[PDB]
Amino acid sequence: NRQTERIKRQREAVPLTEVGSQCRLTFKLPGISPFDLGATVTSPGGVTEAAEIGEVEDGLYGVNFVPKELGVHTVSVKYQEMHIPGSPFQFTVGPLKDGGAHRVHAGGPGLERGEQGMPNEFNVWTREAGAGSLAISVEGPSKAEIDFKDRKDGSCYVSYVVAEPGEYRVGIKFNDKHIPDSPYKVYITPS
Amino acid sequence: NRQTERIKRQREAVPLTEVGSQCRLTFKLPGISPFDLGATVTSPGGVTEAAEIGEVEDGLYGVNFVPKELGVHTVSVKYQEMHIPGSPFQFTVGPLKDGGAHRVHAGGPGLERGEQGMPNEFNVWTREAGAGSLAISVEGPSKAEIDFKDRKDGSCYVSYVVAEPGEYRVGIKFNDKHIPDSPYKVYITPS
């Protein structure tokens, strides 16, 4: 069978990031232990400082940092040579100089593998994409149930459930264009 | 100063509610123990049955019932002869026979009063409206920050924060029409 479930949201660009302001990159860690991760911020000049990782609410973690110059900063969250899904993140200070689907990151186990009747979860980060429509679709042998939490920081956390095992397609589009790794092929295992 | 912040989401109709299916109304407690509330379901014939209240995800509660016939059922959640915000709720069993903004309910403290810099929360119930666009706007002396969680049951839980005290307007529109009590006048008090 082929059944499809789709949601979309529209949001304006995240408010301008001023030089010297308190910034935060948030991430949920479906299937990853927070305890031994390291965060770094790299300035547009290539200077890297360690940044602390805090719990923001139950299950939500954040990298707190303060940028000292204009332009595109990188925020890395790693275990040894491994990045967490989505890392390294980009973070523009001052006005956005680019936008659109190619700037969107996404990650988490619901974009790779799950189990029949269990929640499949992933994060999407749209702050660098600027204003527009984030669309999510799930297609496969059953009609997914989709919940999502869309935040002021341009991040969106998705949880979907499917009734039947099989091969599913998860589409993530921003202003009607696939983000770089979309669509995602997802296998759902039997109970 | 007059600033507006707006988000929108689009979702397909909630799947067909069938006779003998598990149905659930999800709500936030109105500062009252769940042991002290009474939920009832009224059939299309006017027969009322007591229904169970139980905790469900995200600190929310649910009213669970199983419809025995086609047609519009009413779910009330009460303390003595007072309704919780949004009650009584309607639940069509069988295909939707109506739709649109006039079928949407909303409620919570964020549609009445809040405090500068603190979260202002409310729920929206769209299952009876069918497929469409839900738009949430906040207009007032500062630009709101808005988070929302949009669920498979057609409910959307909103949290917004404003930087300045004063008189705000909260708009709730479905396919670009105000729902029955929108726009809402909201006073935000100083810290």
Q: Which of A6, A8, A147 sits opposite B151 (nearest CB)?
A: A147
List the one residue out of B112, B95, B121, B111 whose CA is nearest residue B28: B121
Residue A127: count of CB within 10 angstroms of its CB: 21
What are the b/e assignments for A1-20, b being 16+ CB within 10 Å? eeeebbbbbbbebbeebeee
Match 């974009």 to its residue by tokens.
A111
CB contact under 8 Å between A7 and B149, yes or no, is no
Shortest distance between the Cα of B4 and any Cα of chain A, in A, equals 11
Q: Which of A5, A146, A152 sits opposite B145 (nearest CB)?
A: A152
Phi, psi of A67, deg, nearest 5? -75, 150
A34 burial type by CB count under 10 A (0-12 exposed, 13-18 middle, 19+ buried): middle
Question: What CA–CA distances, in Å, run from B150 to A79, A90, A160, B161?
Answer: 33, 27, 12, 18
The H or E element that residue A20 is part of is none
Q: Which residues of chain A neighbour B15 with C-beta distances below 8 Å? A: 143
Shortest distance between the Cα of A11 and any Cα of chain B, in A, equals 5
**What is the rounded CA–CA span in Å between residue A10 and residue A174?**
10
CB contact under 8 Å between A148 and B150, yes or no, is yes
Q: Which of A5, A9, A146 sits opposite B7 (nearest CB)?
A: A9
CB contact under 8 Å between B149 and A145, yes or no, is no
Shortest distance between the Cα of A188 and any Cα of chain B, in A, equals 20
Q: A122 with A110: CB under 8 angstroms?
A: yes
List the one residue out of A159, A103, A169, A171 whose CA is nearest residue A131: A103
CB contact under 8 Å between B8 and A12, yes or no, is no
CB contact under 8 Å between B9 and A6, yes or no, is no
Shortest distance between the Cα of B30 and any Cα of chain A, in A, equals 22
Cis peptide before B30 (omega within 30 of 0): no
A23-93: CATH superfamily: Immunoglobulins (2.60.40.10)
